[PDB]
Amino acid sequence: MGSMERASLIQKAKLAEQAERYEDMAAFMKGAVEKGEELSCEERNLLSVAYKNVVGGQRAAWRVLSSIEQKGPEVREYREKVETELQGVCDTVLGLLDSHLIKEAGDAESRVFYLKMKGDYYRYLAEVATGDDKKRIIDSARSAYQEAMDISKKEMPPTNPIRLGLALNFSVFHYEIANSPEEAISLAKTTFDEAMADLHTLSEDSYKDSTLIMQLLRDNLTLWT
Amino acid sequence: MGSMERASLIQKAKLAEQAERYEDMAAFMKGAVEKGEELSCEERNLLSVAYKNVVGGQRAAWRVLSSIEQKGPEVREYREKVETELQGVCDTVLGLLDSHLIKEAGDAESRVFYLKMKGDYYRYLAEVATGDDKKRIIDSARSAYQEAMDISKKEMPPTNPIRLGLALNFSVFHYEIANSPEEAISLAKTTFDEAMADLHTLSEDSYKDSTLIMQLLRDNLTLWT
Amino acid sequence: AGSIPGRRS
Amino acid sequence: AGSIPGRRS
Ligand SMILES: *Cc1ccc(S(=O)(=O)N2CCCc3cc(Cl)ccc32)cc1
Ligand SMILES: *Cc1ccc(S(=O)(=O)N2CCCc3cc(Cl)ccc32)cc1
Ligand SMILES: [Cl-]
Ligand SMILES: [Cl-]
Ligand SMILES: [Cl-]
Ligand SMILES: [Cl-]
Ligand SMILES: [Mg+2]
Numbered sequence: 084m085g086s087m088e089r090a091s092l093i094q095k096a097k098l099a100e101q102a103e104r105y106e107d108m109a110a111f112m113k114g115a116v117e118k119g120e121e122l123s124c125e126e127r128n129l130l131s132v133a134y135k136n137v138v139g140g141q142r143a144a145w146r147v148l149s150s151i152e153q154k155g156p157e158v159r160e161y162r163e164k165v166e167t168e169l170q171g172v173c174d175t176v177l178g179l180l181d182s183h184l185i186k187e188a189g190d191a192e193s194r195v196f197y198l199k200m201k202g203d204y205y206r207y208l209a210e211v212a213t214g215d216d217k218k219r220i221i222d223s224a225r226s227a228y229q230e231a232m233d234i235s236k237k238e239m240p241p242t243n244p245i246r247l248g249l250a251l252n253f254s255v256f257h258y259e260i261a262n263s264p265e266e267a268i269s270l271a272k273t274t275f276d277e278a279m280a281d282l283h284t285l286s287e288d289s290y291k292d293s294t295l296i297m298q299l300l301r302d303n304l305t306l307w308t
Numbered sequence: 309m310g311s312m313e314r315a316s317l318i319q320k321a322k323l324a325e326q327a328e329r330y331e332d333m334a335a336f337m338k339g340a341v342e343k344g345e346e347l348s349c350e351e352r353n354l355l356s357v358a359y360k361n362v363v364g365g366q367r368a369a370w371r372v373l374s375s376i377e378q379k380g381p382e383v384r385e386y387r388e389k390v391e392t393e394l395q396g397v398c399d400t401v402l403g404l405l406d407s408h409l410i411k412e413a414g415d416a417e418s419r420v421f422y423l424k425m426k427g428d429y430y431r432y433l434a435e436v437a438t439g440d441d442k443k444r445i446i447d448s449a450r451s452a453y454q455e456a457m458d459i460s461k462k463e464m465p466p467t468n469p470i471r472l473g474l475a476l477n478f479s480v481f482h483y484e485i486a487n488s489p490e491e492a493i494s495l496a497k498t499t500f501d502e503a504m505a506d507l508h509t510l511s512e513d514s515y516k517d518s519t520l521i522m523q524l525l526r527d528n529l530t531l532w533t
Numbered sequence: 534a535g536s537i538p539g540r541r542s
Numbered sequence: 543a544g545s546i547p548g549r550r551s
């Protein structure tokens with residue numbers, strides 16, 4: 084995408100989302116990041132939407148194949164093929180975050196957003212990991228989420244939607260990856276309750292966003308308890 | 309796919325469908341066709357499912373983009389990009405049919421199936437065509453569907469599901485491509501009525517298949533009248 | 534309108 | 543369970 088203007092890449096990412104062409108969307112956003120400039124709030128959301136959809140589809144396919152495999156070499160080979168492609172996308176996202184989105188992000192909102200992404204893509208790698216590096220992959224996710232949590236608690240109100248989504252995802256990490264369901268439940272409960280107590284400060288539109296994510300926290304708590 | 313066994317390609321196409329990985333499915337089926345052997349009934353359905361899904365997604369994206377365009381160069385450029393990829397897939401399918409699926413298909417069921425596909429992929433090309441060859445693309449679809457119709461009427465009962473699906477798709481061609489809505493309605497009506505009159509000959513399972521496609525004919529007739 | 538689907542569903 | 547979606551929907 085090196086020959087396309089930054090603004091054209093952003094425009095085409097928005098078109099690709101409307102057309103449900105998420106692989107294209109991700110390629111346009113990778114090209115935009117590689118222009119070397121920081122991303123605005125809207126642009127960070129385009130980047131996240133694109134890769135979350137791509138990897139989300141790979142994860143769903145890997146789960147179908149892994150279930151068939153658990154129940155000739157073809158099933159294992161094909162699961163391995165999908166797994167390698169998933170790992171490749173996660174590595175690409177982590178590479179964008181490391182070169183150089185995180186290091187240039189100084190405002191709390193941008194830095195937390197990117198560290199939450201970093202935790203998420205290490206979490207997706209952990210979902211498929213089995214080898215000598217599995218513990219290290221899990222700890223890489225934990226470390227990214229933890230740094231994001233520490234910044235969010237110092238710099239953002241308890242209803243901030245990035246802070247809430249981070250806590251949601253870190254709670255999923257605890258439950259599904261780290262084998263720490265009590266930590267997951269405690270984080271989700273404390274996050275929900277501290278957000279509830281700050282809703283009175285919000286406008287109607289901020290209220291809607293915070294309560295939307297609070298409902299996701301509650302949905303998980305209902306599933307886990 | 310030249311180094312993978314035919315049977316492994318077929319197996320992986322079935323897995324790819326279960327995992328909703330239709331691009332993979334199509335690549336596995338292209339590899340199977342390129343082994344040079346004829347396809348069984350089940351294998352013909354895998355080939356059709358794979359490419360119909362891939363091109364169906366491209367068509368939906370092209371329609372979103374074409375609508376935005378109709379309402380800088382970026383929208384047109386991106387619509388053109390999706391259009392070129394759609395044309396490439398249609399050309400690939402038509403190439404498989406021409407080298408050498410159709411020429412080796414002697415039984416009415418196989419030959420009609422492939423000629424129906426040929427009509428469909430020329431129809432998809434016609435949906436996006438605007439240049440000097442647009443009339444020729446339309447006539448190529450017409451010619452393929454017509455040959456399939458002629459064989460089906462001589463060799464298959466009026467309830468045969470391939471005959472019914474062919475008539476359904478050719479009726480869509482008449483309405484949406486050829487600007488012949490009366491021909492479309494007449495074909496759908498006569499097909500429906502002749503199938504109705506032959507349902508008494510069918511087992512429960514054949515009845516279910518024929519009536520499923522008859523309902524699609526009826527749904528179009530309701531939309532068109 | 535609608536053409537034939539790839540599978541019965 | 544569920545993680546954050548890419549868009550509000
Ligand atoms: C991780 C995270 C990312 C973005 C937001 S948000 O900007 O507040 N927003 C935009 C798209 C995703 C989303 C989803 C919900 Cl349920 C609420 C708000 C948003 C929050 C968290
Ligand atoms: C064009 C066409 C292809 C296949 C068939 S079928 O084998 O009878 N069958 C299999 C999958 C698609 C389908 C859809 C319906 Cl509604 C009914 C039967 C089938 C028929 C026509
Ligand atoms: Cl494979
Ligand atoms: Cl900065
Ligand atoms: Cl483009
Ligand atoms: Cl033959
Ligand atoms: Mg420039």
Ligand SMILES: [Mg+2]
Nearest residue numbers: 312313314315
């Ligand atoms: Mg062999």
